[PDB]
Design an enzyme around this catalytic site. Sequence first.
Site, PDB file in Angstrom:
ATOM      1  N   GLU A 149      -2.640  -3.836   7.114  1.00  0.00           N
ATOM      2  CA  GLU A 149      -3.550  -4.971   7.020  1.00  0.00           C
ATOM      3  C   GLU A 149      -3.437  -5.604   5.622  1.00  0.00           C
ATOM      4  O   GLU A 149      -3.429  -4.894   4.616  1.00  0.00           O
ATOM      5  CB  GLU A 149      -4.981  -4.516   7.330  1.00  0.00           C
ATOM      6  CG  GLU A 149      -5.785  -3.971   6.133  1.00  0.00           C
ATOM      7  CD  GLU A 149      -5.306  -2.622   5.587  1.00  0.00           C
ATOM      8  OE1 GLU A 149      -4.307  -2.037   6.085  1.00  0.00           O
ATOM      9  OE2 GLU A 149      -5.970  -2.121   4.652  1.00  0.00           O
ATOM     10  N   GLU A 189      -5.631  -2.634  12.666  1.00  0.00           N
ATOM     11  CA  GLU A 189      -5.491  -3.547  11.528  1.00  0.00           C
ATOM     12  C   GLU A 189      -6.583  -4.599  11.542  1.00  0.00           C
ATOM     13  O   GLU A 189      -7.025  -5.050  10.471  1.00  0.00           O
ATOM     14  CB  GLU A 189      -4.099  -4.192  11.508  1.00  0.00           C
ATOM     15  CG  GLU A 189      -2.931  -3.171  11.586  1.00  0.00           C
ATOM     16  CD  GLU A 189      -3.040  -1.984  10.621  1.00  0.00           C
ATOM     17  OE1 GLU A 189      -3.656  -2.091   9.548  1.00  0.00           O
ATOM     18  OE2 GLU A 189      -2.481  -0.922  10.963  1.00  0.00           O
ATOM     19  N   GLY A 243       3.220   2.364  11.053  1.00  0.00           N
ATOM     20  CA  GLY A 243       2.911   1.527  12.212  1.00  0.00           C
ATOM     21  C   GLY A 243       2.599   0.088  11.843  1.00  0.00           C
ATOM     22  O   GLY A 243       3.133  -0.840  12.448  1.00  0.00           O
ATOM     23  N   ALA A 244       1.684  -0.101  10.905  1.00  0.00           N
ATOM     24  CA  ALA A 244       1.355  -1.470  10.471  1.00  0.00           C
ATOM     25  C   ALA A 244       0.553  -1.460   9.190  1.00  0.00           C
ATOM     26  O   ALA A 244       0.176  -0.398   8.679  1.00  0.00           O
ATOM     27  CB  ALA A 244       0.570  -2.208  11.558  1.00  0.00           C
ATOM     28  N   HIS A 289      -9.867  -3.257  10.084  1.00  0.00           N
ATOM     29  CA  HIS A 289      -9.836  -3.207   8.623  1.00  0.00           C
ATOM     30  C   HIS A 289     -10.478  -4.420   7.944  1.00  0.00           C
ATOM     31  O   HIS A 289     -10.884  -4.284   6.799  1.00  0.00           O
ATOM     32  CB  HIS A 289      -8.400  -3.075   8.078  1.00  0.00           C
ATOM     33  CG  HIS A 289      -7.923  -1.659   7.900  1.00  0.00           C
ATOM     34  ND1 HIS A 289      -8.605  -0.724   7.143  1.00  0.00           N
ATOM     35  CD2 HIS A 289      -6.825  -1.027   8.375  1.00  0.00           C
ATOM     36  CE1 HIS A 289      -7.954   0.426   7.173  1.00  0.00           C
ATOM     37  NE2 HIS A 289      -6.868   0.276   7.917  1.00  0.00           N
ATOM     38  N   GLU A 313       0.843  -1.200   0.000  1.00  0.00           N
ATOM     39  CA  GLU A 313       0.000   0.000   0.000  1.00  0.00           C
ATOM     40  C   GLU A 313       0.883   1.257   0.000  1.00  0.00           C
ATOM     41  O   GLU A 313       1.867   1.318   0.745  1.00  0.00           O
ATOM     42  CB  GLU A 313      -0.956   0.013   1.205  1.00  0.00           C
ATOM     43  CG  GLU A 313      -1.983   1.126   1.100  1.00  0.00           C
ATOM     44  CD  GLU A 313      -3.065   1.097   2.166  1.00  0.00           C
ATOM     45  OE1 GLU A 313      -3.157   0.120   2.948  1.00  0.00           O
ATOM     46  OE2 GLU A 313      -3.838   2.074   2.201  1.00  0.00           O
ATOM     47  N   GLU A 318      -9.806   4.668   6.047  1.00  0.00           N
ATOM     48  CA  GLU A 318      -8.945   4.969   7.189  1.00  0.00           C
ATOM     49  C   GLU A 318      -9.646   5.750   8.287  1.00  0.00           C
ATOM     50  O   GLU A 318      -9.483   5.440   9.460  1.00  0.00           O
ATOM     51  CB  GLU A 318      -7.693   5.728   6.759  1.00  0.00           C
ATOM     52  CG  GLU A 318      -6.791   4.889   5.829  1.00  0.00           C
ATOM     53  CD  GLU A 318      -6.355   3.565   6.453  1.00  0.00           C
ATOM     54  OE1 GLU A 318      -6.317   3.469   7.692  1.00  0.00           O
ATOM     55  OE2 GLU A 318      -6.041   2.622   5.708  1.00  0.00           O
TER      56      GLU A 318
END
Length: 888
Positions: free
Chosen positions: A267, A301, A264-265, A304, A123, A323
Amino acid sequence: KIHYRKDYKPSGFIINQVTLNINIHDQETIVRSVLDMDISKHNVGEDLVFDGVGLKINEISINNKKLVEGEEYTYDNEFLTIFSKFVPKSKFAFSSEVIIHPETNYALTGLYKSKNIIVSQCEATGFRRITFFIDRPDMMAKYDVTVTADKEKYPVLLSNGDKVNEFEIPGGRHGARFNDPPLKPCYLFAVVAGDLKHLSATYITKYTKKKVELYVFSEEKYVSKLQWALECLKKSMAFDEDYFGLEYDLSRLNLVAVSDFNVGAMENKGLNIFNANSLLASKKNSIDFSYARILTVVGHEYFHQYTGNRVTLRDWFQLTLKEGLTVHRENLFSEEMTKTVTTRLSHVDLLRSVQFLEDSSPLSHPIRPESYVSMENFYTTTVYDKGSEVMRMYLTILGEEYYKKGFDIYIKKNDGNTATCEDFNYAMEQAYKMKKADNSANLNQYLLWFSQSGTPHVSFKYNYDAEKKQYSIHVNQYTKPDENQKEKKPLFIPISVGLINPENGKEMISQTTLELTKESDTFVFNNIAVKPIPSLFRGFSAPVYIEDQLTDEERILLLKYDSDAFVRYNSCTNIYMKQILMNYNEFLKAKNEKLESFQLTPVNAQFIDAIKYLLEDPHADAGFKSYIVSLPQDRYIINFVSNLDTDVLADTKEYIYKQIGDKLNDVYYKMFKSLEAKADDLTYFNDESHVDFDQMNMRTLRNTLLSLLSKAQYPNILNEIIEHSKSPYPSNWLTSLSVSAYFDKYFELYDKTYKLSKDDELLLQEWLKTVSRSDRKDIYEILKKLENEVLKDSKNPNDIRAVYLPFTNNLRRFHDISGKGYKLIAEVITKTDKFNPMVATQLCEPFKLWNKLDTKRQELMLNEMNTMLQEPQISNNLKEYLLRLTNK
Ligand SMILES: Nc1cccc(C(=O)N[C@@H](C(=O)NO)c2ccc(-n3cccn3)cc2)c1
Ligand SMILES: [Mg+2]
Ligand SMILES: [Zn+2]
């Protein structure tokens, strides 16, 4: 190249199936890809153009025939163009084999190596760095993926979907095939290879009672830091079941920590990949902040998923739809899990400092922007945090029952399809009609929250008629014109209000949400027995500048007796701001006029009394207490001051803190001592699944008080600092480092805490931050020492951010009038931009307020930005960002 929202058009092509073979070798990775494609109804005979960045072509083919470069296709390291005459007009296969190099991919987008783990980050536009694709979120395909690698180095192979084969390969290699039948966009593709160790558990869903395998992975060294993450994941699944009635759709969920990560992370349908600092913790090796961080990022995450596998973004301009909604869900989760009022307060604190700054800067944009150059630059606090407040306002307006009904409608009407912000608004509009019992009611005005940039200002005037028992609140809204709209329109602003009886502190009316839909309105209340004090925007019910027009006496009463945490906190904030603006102007005038003497307005004595009252209340909340003894953030303050002289602001803060400390330090000391037993309780220190957010708030309060006492040189406080350094809790012994800055014990605690930190990667990064943020007159020399002895040439974004970003918040030193701090951070940005443009743009953060400072510092910052802009090798990301930031 600039992309416009209004230019959206469906592809003239279809990709139905992706079949990948990813072969990882020591010095190269070979990617073979077959795309089963078709021609769409929107096709008009155009060239077939694929995204592909930095790929080395071994060969490409259509229907198993090799294409010839120059005659049949061109490739410029960004787009692969196959001329239309060689493009079939019915269903066809496109195939390619390319070479990529994750070992040298330091930008951490696409496929890259983090220490001894190979991982992907696709992404928003990273999949095109792995293989050719029509790399946009509305191109939905099925995926069949095979990964091969050395077995010793990479025993664990992961990708989306189900592992359907595992096989041995000559030469000590092995492979694994993953088939993921449901359609997905390519930015949700992921692969992981590594010597991963794990913790696991089985979760049984609420309604269908199906078993879900949960795995959390890290390198072997840190496998003991995985327990809290696993707990958080179970907590997330339970929450979405209980609040939203949503079960996990798949049979397995994997979370993976990696050391090198830009954000941060991420999905990725069943394979979620995390910055290690947002997944790993242990009580011995982590500060308290890590626990709420892991909880929110794992939650985020997780939330999501449900929405992600039913409704995909049509295009990237709808980013705030996934988001902002997911952050809203994350915040609801976090509030319910922590059960502390500081959770919502911390979200507001962040919005009103960082996001309000962004929204009054040249970078200001609506949560649904009209154009972009670089997608990476769009993942902003505006899109995320203002987006979440816009999503949250639907809940405030509708209440739980109807909100949960409009949310269901949005899924149903849009399941299996791509959606836009309008689709979500339409769904809530149906819930709004049902709530108002009125099919003529609409939310068309609410759409301005998506399209209109800038922070609305909301102001009040009041009237009370004692004989009539009639109270009126007159409300006004205004948004300042900016570069995005010459004319601003009034928004739909929900104003949650209460009315407090000043004589006994009681609520005078039931829960009430005023719906302001015009530029101004007057709200009248009858049978109001006595003149109330209005409690406005309870819960911070709209993302606006609040001008409450209350006296400090009224604000003190709210602070002491109101029921709403935010309004109490805001009333305190407003008292501080009035004081800060007043003293700032007095210091400024004295500086400008070169006064030999002058007066300063003291801090309101009744306000200091109220702080003491609250601190001494054993029944009051520790986290809230830490907020009331802290002045508003510098980045919040700057929204209210033109041509901010940072030296004058630093003198202003100093004066105000000393005024309050001169009255309350004995109180602070007493509380610091009495809080020790409960705050530092070790009963569950070796239980990694036992997390007590109240206890952590008590430590926050103690560490805040200790900071106040250290700055003030309270008698023999160094004794307490030294004892504090012996605490088992890193939040405590790192605090002892930063508060020891005011004493010549600092470099001894520097060495002690370094020795404690150096053997844990994440802990060392917290040490670096503590050093970076230390209030030291010799901070520039200290930073140089960090560069030479610890950071060196690390390309780990966590290391670089740890060393430099906290220092940029040093109001007195980063803003040194020589401009040495601006020069330093610009050198780091330019250096970082050579290998990681996304992180270079993050390091630009201090420059965002450049045009708010005094004219000398404006010039200094501008010079550095123009210097950076003139670097020949500047990335597209950094160039776009600085061009926008400098109005060029
Ligand atoms: N709270 C908090 C603070 C800081 C960052 C994040 C964060 O990691 N947010 C991520 C997200 O939404 N994951 O689902 C996320 C994902 C991707 C990007 N991205 C930027 C450019 C390309 N991609 C940015 C953020 C969360
Ligand atoms: Mg390359
Ligand atoms: Zn997200």
